[PDB]
Amino acid sequence: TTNYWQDWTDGVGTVNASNLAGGQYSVSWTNCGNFVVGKGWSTGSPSRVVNYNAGAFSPNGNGYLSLYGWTRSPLIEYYVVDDWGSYRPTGTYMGTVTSDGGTYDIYTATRVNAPSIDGTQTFTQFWSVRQSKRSIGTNNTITFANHVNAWKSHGMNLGSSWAYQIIATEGYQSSGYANVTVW
Ligand SMILES: O[C@@H]1[C@@H](O)[C@H](O)OC[C@H]1O
Numbered sequence: 565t566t567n568y569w570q571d572w573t574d575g576v577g578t579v580n581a582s583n584l585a586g587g588q589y590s591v592s593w594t595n596c597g598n599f600v601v602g603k604g605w606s607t608g609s610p611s612r613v614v615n616y617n618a619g620a621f622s623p624n625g626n627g628y629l630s631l632y633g634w635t636r637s638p639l640i641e642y643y644v645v646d647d648w649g650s651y652r653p654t655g656t657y658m659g660t661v662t663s664d665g666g667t668y669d670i671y672t673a674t675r676v677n678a679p680s681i682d683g684t685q686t687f688t689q690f691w692s693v694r695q696s697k698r699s700i701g702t703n704n705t706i707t708f709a710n711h712v713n714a715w716k717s718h719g720m721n722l723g724s725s726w727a728y729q730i731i732a733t734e735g736y737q738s739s740g741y742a743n744v745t746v747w
Pocket of ligand 1: 572
């Protein structure tokens with residue numbers, strides 16, 4: 565089960581996040597800047613199988629629902645995006661991976677002098693983005709090893725030092741509400 569609660573916001577707009585029982589959380593936001601809220605594990609694993617049920621995911625504008633985390637050495641931000649609002653995230657196309665009943669496009673991207681778990685840094689993003697939005701309110705599994713190994717085949721090797729790993733609600737200049745249980 566989960567051991568970690570993440571509640572990060574850049575302070576722009578109103579973001580109200582609740583650390584509920586077990587692996588459950590909720591977040592309501594209005595005209596946010598950027599925020600990342602979710603539950604998961606303080607140390608990510610490339611072989612973790614993550615389950616979640618989004619009782620609600622209703623962005624009004626740009627919001628994502630993703631398996632989300634960081635490695636260091638090198639500094640990499642990674643996503644497995646199952647749902648989004650008005651904006652589907654993309655980068656440089658690398659291929660596809662089919663996992664847990666969905667097909668995901670794979671992308672890389674460079675972020676130059678950008679916010680990160682270690683402050684302003686130049687780093688890389690690894691993305692799997694579902695080709696269509698996954699069903700909301702169902703018990704959904706992300707078999708992360710499939711994504712890790714699909715990424716490896718394209719030279720997207722994750723860092724050797726693992727930071728947190730969560731099912732994250734992320735908003736960008738938007739409003740919305742989400743309620744999610746992770747295990
Ligand atoms: O973990 C936070 C990350 O989610 C955000 O993107 O940049 C600052 C970090 O502390």
